[PDB]
Write a protein that binds this DNA or RNA. Sequence first.
DNA 1: TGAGGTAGTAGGTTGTATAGT
RNA 2: ACAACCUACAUACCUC
Length: 684
Amino acid sequence: NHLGKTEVFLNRFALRPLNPEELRPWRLEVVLDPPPGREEVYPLLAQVARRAGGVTVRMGDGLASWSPPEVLVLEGTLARMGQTYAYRLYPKGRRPLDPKDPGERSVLSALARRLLQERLRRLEGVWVEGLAVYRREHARGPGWRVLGGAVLDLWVSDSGAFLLEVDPAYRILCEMSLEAWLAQGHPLPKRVRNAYDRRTWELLRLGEEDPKELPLPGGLSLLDYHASKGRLQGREGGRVAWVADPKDPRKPIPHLTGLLVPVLTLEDLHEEEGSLALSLPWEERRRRTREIASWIGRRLGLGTPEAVRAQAYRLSIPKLMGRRAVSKPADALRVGFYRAQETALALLRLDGAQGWPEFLRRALLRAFGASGASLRLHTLHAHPSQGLAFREALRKAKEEGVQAVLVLTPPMAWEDRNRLKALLLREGLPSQILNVPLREEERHRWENALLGLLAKAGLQVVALSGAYPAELAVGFDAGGRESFRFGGAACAVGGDGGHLLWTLPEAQAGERIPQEVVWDLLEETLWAFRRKAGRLPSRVLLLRNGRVPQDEFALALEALAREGIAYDLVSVRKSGGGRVYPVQGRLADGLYVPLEDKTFLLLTVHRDFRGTPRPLKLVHEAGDTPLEALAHQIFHLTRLYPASGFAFPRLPAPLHLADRLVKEVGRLGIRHLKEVDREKLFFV
DNA sequence: TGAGGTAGTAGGTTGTATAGT
RNA sequence: ACAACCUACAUACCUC
Ligand SMILES: [Mg+2]
């Protein structure tokens, strides 16, 4: 291997191999009357394990248990969606289970997790929410405290051992009333909770009215209302607080500051305690992970936790190219772009002012200068508020070669931001917004806006230098909406990624992308590749955001086989990688950690040293390229994103683009894009 | 709307198996 | 519940 080896710890710990009594659980038969449904079988079975108590988990059509029947509720009744059933338990003996059997250890692990939860529940000082355990005050001030602990997990190996996973976690508690909060000179909190339950509101403002006068819609006093429900006992109804249901922060609602509790944010506490942060440097996290594991191991009698370690590899650093070698995409602004054509940009200024700020103009002129390309700056002399007549000014501008517009504006409300983007999109004019209290020293902001204005005009700002197996990299993502999704793709064409493009996403019902929409989108990207290279890709790299639904690529993969195109399919999850810590030395991004076959972690970005990185977990779902070669290419593709300028995304450019793309479309809609080139990244 | 990221609180989702015959 | 993920706070906070 030409890559440097390193050892790492995962945040997992190996514990004892299971004993006899743990492998052979009390089995049981479940007789539900009225007999269950079909979509309601498992859900009711599980609600029976919780209703039976003890270390019980469902197994097939019944349940397994690490508890004696003599402490199990064998006769009872639970009410599901409409129907009221009655259960009865029949001890079907005590059969042994098999750690190798995938779906059997699913039960063993299930029980392990249940064991862990009950042992924790009986501990005195600790607070336990699900699998998170908080055990120690970590910080505190007047009225608030932060508890420290860790979310945990206990599962069973294929090889019959217990596995403990630990990751440090914090909980912020505020226990003072809003009245007291404000009386001690603190600022208004954006959100606020009921003192008598969990209902939490957004806090609009304080009221000048009197509680005992504030007439409650249909009845009595603001105060008398609350008094009625006995909420003033051992409390003081304070002043009037106007709040709003966060789902529709319009209609204001009367409340008492004596009965609201602030919900605090890390910054409301960094104001008090100061220098208090909830993210950890990786070495502090590693230390605390080890401490916590040892703490629990000692309350658990499953052996001494032995931190599991893996072999990691430092991947080669990507050589990023502008017109000349660059180290981040913003440097292309100084050196020149990878490939700049003739381009024309327009300005729409929506403060009271007029004309291109000279420093932006010069920055642009310099950038095109270094690149040896022509630039023609235009200025829209029309206002969005001129209604339909505005459109004639936009059409005029596109009919003069304008490829994108810079919008100089005061901060716009989200509604108006979308309204405007859309409005310019109708005329095939992608837009970059730049907020207008703006000063030349605010450099990272306007230089990023510039990088975006250029991607939106179709310029390729950077490309890779290197040899990769795949000449086409395409990433697939689903949806930028709640009750339905989108599903689209973005594209790194050429082995250098010399071109980036997107494809119009297609509305769908859930996560799963219709088998044929997958192949459709893929075909779009192959035709893109063909008219750039005059030929078909010899090999493609296929990437999905998140899990890959069962054979949703099956149809697309056979079509590729038909056409004689080679391929790999990788699933890229943002969660589920846990943590990775060097045993010795620094940790730099570019970290590759093989796990099982067809799977590995990739530490793609490390940069904000006050926080701990979260590795991507990747699964090799189809194809037979060496894991390490996939890792190498994914990693480098990380560096290809044009619109970030000063920091690389954690995701490979195509998956990061696909994400951004389905989010934009879910926000703006699918209309107004017929006249927007697919090389113009309108959505960055 | 500058954009990369790690951390929280409060309130959400889809994908999975699940019979009958 | 397991698994993968969304939104609000948040143009927040940290970072360049
Ligand atoms: Mg943007």
